Design a protein around this ligand. Structure first.
Ligand SMILES: CCCCCCCCCCCCC/C=C/[C@@H](O)[C@H](CO[C@@H]1O[C@H](CO)[C@H](O)[C@H](OS(=O)(=O)O)[C@H]1O)NC(=O)CCCCCCCCCCCCCCCCC
Ligand SMILES: *[C@@H]1O[C@H](CO)[C@@H](O[C@@H]2O[C@H](CO)[C@@H](O)[C@H](O)[C@H]2NC(C)=O)[C@H](O)[C@H]1NC(C)=O
Ligand SMILES: *[C@@H]1O[C@H](CO)[C@@H](O[C@@H]2O[C@H](CO)[C@@H](O)[C@H](O)[C@H]2NC(C)=O)[C@H](O)[C@H]1NC(C)=O
Ligand SMILES: *[C@H]1O[C@H](CO[C@@H]2O[C@@H](C)[C@@H](O)[C@@H](O)[C@@H]2O)[C@@H](O)[C@H](O)[C@H]1NC(C)=O
Ligand SMILES: C[C@@H]1O[C@@H](O)[C@@H](O)[C@H](O)[C@@H]1O
Lengths: 99, 274
């Protein structure tokens, strides 16, 4: 079987312009394990991004947490970009503090 | 439902391309990795050693040293007759469970291409009925070595029970800790003309059990929708609880959070429309 990834983006703390936070992208429910995940700042790849060791759920589907420190600003846009074989184009989910 | 399990993720992409990962997990929490470069078990926490001696760990390192390579190599060589087609993936999870402070069961299951394929039960490998003939063939090959199946059985029914009890005891201060959440309110995507979505974020709690509801005074708002409990890098959890409402009925709404760590003082936040 093949399973398409679910992608969820969130901050660790309430957004506050100019104060340091953590941006998270949780990618779950996918198969096979091969996946490309990037955090973006203004559409552009963020360089030092950490991730958990690959694991899988009881249904055999895989999951990963990607995260980095970041400082929310009025102007700056943050997002998670995912490519997987189940997707025809890379999926981008934006961080929005009020959505 | 407290369990410990070792996972194997083996990916076979090409003729000459492949990856093999082994790790240990106390439910959601990683406690171990296998380091193939150094051929050793990496303890992620000081208490990951459980109550096992250095000598028992060496022996277990040898077992994983030999078994990881023989299993990887074995699947690559049997792939042709088993009709495993590139690219493919094999997953294994093995371990034991606890119900009410007593080891309730041990398990060992293998998946091919994300689906149940074979399992080890009662000292032999058994095919998953819908996996078809290739699963029966795979078990025919795995059941040809009683010696090796007895080692496997000893590890599931003697080593693992002993280990998990020792691991939960040694890790007791980490696993019995209480961390208080913080919460905040925001808007969510609008359901349509004249309506809003209200969102209560609950972040940084441990352990996992939590209660969150939108309220009008003492009246629980049954339209409250809980999202998935999502992890953070520091080991705590995050949850969103949403509520859809007509614009004119957003007044007097609040979010109430109850957690084990709060010592009876619930977090209460009020939605401000002024
Ligand atoms: C990082 C982890 C540290 C955790 C420490 C805590 C210890 C607590 C005990 C946890 C038990 C975990 C579950 C154990 C499952 C075992 O069945 C299982 C052993 O299966 C292997 O099957 C092979 C044949 O199919 C061979 O018989 C091999 O033996 S050998 O002589 O050829 O090397 C045999 O090892 N695993 C372990 O013992 C732990 C190491 C696991 C490494 C990944 C392999 C998982 C098994 C996959 C199935 C085997 C595919 C074989 C292909 C055909 C080859 C003929
Ligand atoms: C697990 O395997 C055991 C061992 O072969 C089975 O127990 C034997 O069953 C036969 C026939 O029912 C009895 O005559 C023997 O006395 C049993 N052996 C022992 C050691 O008691 C058992 O049936 C299997 N269980 C399952 C559910 O798979
Ligand atoms: C680690 O702890 C386990 C769990 O207590 C120990 O195993 C128990 O030992 C008692 C008496 O010493 C036995 O009567 C129980 O039957 C054991 N329970 C289980 C689940 O096997 C174990 O001895 C400790 N050390 C090691 C090396 O495992
Ligand atoms: C086999 O594949 C190799 C690795 O490919 C890259 O990584 C894997 C995990 C996939 O994500 C794949 O899409 C990537 O391109 C290649 O380097 C190699 O050329 C391939 N060789 C053969 C035999 O086709
Ligand atoms: C950690 C161990 O768990 C089990 C008990 O039998 C032992 O006495 C010890 O508590």
């Amino acid at each position: 079987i093949q399973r398409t990834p679910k992608i969820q983006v969130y901050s660790r703390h309430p957004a506050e312009n100019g104060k340091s936070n953590f941006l998270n992208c949780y990618v779950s429910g996918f198969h096979p394990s091969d996946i490309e995940v990037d955090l973006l700042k203004n559409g552009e790849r963020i360089e030092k991004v950490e991730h958990s060791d690959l694991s899988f759920s009881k249904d055999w589907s895989f999951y990963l947490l990607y995260y980095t420190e970041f400082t929310p600003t009025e102007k700056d846009e943050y997002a998670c970009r995912v490519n997987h074989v189940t997707l025809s184009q890379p999926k981008i989910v934006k961080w929005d503090r009020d959505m | 439902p407290l369990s410990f399990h070792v996972i194997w993720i083996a990916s076979f992409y090409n003729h000459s391309w492949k990856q093999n990962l082994v790790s240990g997990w106390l439910s959601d929490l990683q406690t171990h990795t296998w380091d193939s470069n150094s051929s050793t078990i990496v303890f992620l926490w000081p208490w990951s050693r459980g109550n096992f001696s250095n000598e028992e760990w060496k022996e277990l390192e040898t077992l994983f040293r030999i078994r990881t390579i023989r299993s990887f190599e074995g699947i690559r060589r049997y792939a042709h007759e088993l009709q495993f087609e590139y690219p493919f993936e094999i997953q294994v999870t093995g371990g034991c469970e606890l119900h009410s402070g007593k080891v309730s069961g041990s398990f060992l299951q293998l998946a091919y291409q994300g689906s149940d394929f074979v399992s080890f039960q009662n000292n032999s490998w058994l095919p998953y009925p819908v996996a078809g003939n290739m699963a029966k063939h795979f078990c025919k090959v795995l059941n040809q070595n009683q010696h090796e199946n007895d080692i496997t059985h000893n590890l599931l029914s003697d080593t693992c029970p002993r280990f998990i009890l020792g691991l939960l005891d040694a890790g007791k201060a980490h696993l019995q800790r209480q961390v208080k959440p913080e919460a905040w309110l925001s808007h969510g995507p609008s359901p349509g003309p004249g309506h809003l979505q209200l969102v209560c974020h609950v972040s940084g709690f441990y352990p996992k059990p939590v209660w969150v509801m939108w309220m009008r005074g003492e009246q629980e708002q049954q339209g409250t929708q809980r999202g998935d409990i999502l992890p953070s890098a520091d080991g705590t959890w995050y949850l969103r609880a949403t509520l859809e409402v007509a614009a004119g009925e957003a007044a007097d709404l609040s979010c109430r959070v109850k957690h084990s760590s709060l010592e009876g003082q619930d977090i209460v936040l009020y939605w401000h429309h002024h």
